[PDB]
């Protein structure tokens, strides 16, 4: 037999897998799937469909229930083909509790590794990393660690991107990419492009339209997306969208109501003809808050008569990936951003810290200088908050 493995806290693997296995149930009827996931959820109703077993995650990794079950699953078959579908960041954090039981098993074998980014995660990593003295020689060391280290026969684990990027040197993996193009255009990181070679792939954002009408139904009832009444939303005025992105509370400890209202302030500057926030035209208001923003949300909401909810649970790269992202979209600097096309990206926005305490150290933060990079947005389209 053949079983998946299926194991994410974020949104953007998950929701890359919920395609792969709706495509996988018709492919090969005859396979298990285990799923771990946190931002989205599978019903028994729709796990029934896709012949899926949930179990639950430990914080945001590997649960000793999945681990449990999946040798209780081995030990039974007579031999076991395993594929891992997992978050790229937190790789480490999930397969190695799975791989070090099962290891010495003569029956199983571990036949494919497909990682996903996270978001801006893997990107802030890279950056800090691509100027490291000797890396990929580093990394090439590394990899007996990782093979020693998951055979269990030493105690020592490869540090950094050595317990990242070596998984395709001891088993078939693919590193799905956010923005493969970063290796090309960053040439601190084209050494890293050679050692990954076709192992590295690129994220596709379209094959939800390739599905048919049912398993498209299915996959918007699972993530939770009433995607025709946002259509219907859109066009209920002939001027452009917009869409705000909403974060939860941030540094200095203030009573959620003052997050809340600084945001307010972000919406009305963005309309104000006045601002340097503003937007370029007239548009229609949307909003899509953080799934914890919780009263941040609803006083958002309580001050824009005509603005129209997005469900704030939703994972917001559901939109790019069902075409439904808006003509234009602004907000707080996150993750988010790292999947929109940068002519729908208005403008971004970063708060105050002990840490970021000026424009200048913001525009030098990893986060931005990954971001012009990539072409996303341009610096003057990155602005500072109080
Ligand atoms: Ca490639
Ligand atoms: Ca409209």
Known sequence: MTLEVYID??????????????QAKDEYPSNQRFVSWKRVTVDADN??????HTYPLKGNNTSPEMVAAIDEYAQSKNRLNIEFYTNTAHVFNNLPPIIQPLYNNEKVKISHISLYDDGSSEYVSLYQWKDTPNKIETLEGEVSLLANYLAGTSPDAPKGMGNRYNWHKLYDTDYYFLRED???????????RDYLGSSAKQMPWDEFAKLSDSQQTLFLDIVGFDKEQLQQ???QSPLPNFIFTGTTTWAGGETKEYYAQQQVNVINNAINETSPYYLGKDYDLFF???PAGGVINDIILGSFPDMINIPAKISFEVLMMTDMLPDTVAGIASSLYFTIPADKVNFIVFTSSDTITDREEALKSPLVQVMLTLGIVKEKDVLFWA
Do not use: T
Not at 182 to 192: F, G, K, P, W
């Open 9 to 22: 806290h974020a949104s953007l693997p998950s929701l890359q897998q919920l395609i792969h296995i709706i």
């Open 47 to 52: 796990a029934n469909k896709l012949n899926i």
């Open 182 to 192: 970063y290796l090309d255009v960053e040439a601190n990181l084209h050494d890293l």
């Open 233 to 235: 939303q859109y066009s």
């Open 288 to 290: 899509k808050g953080h």
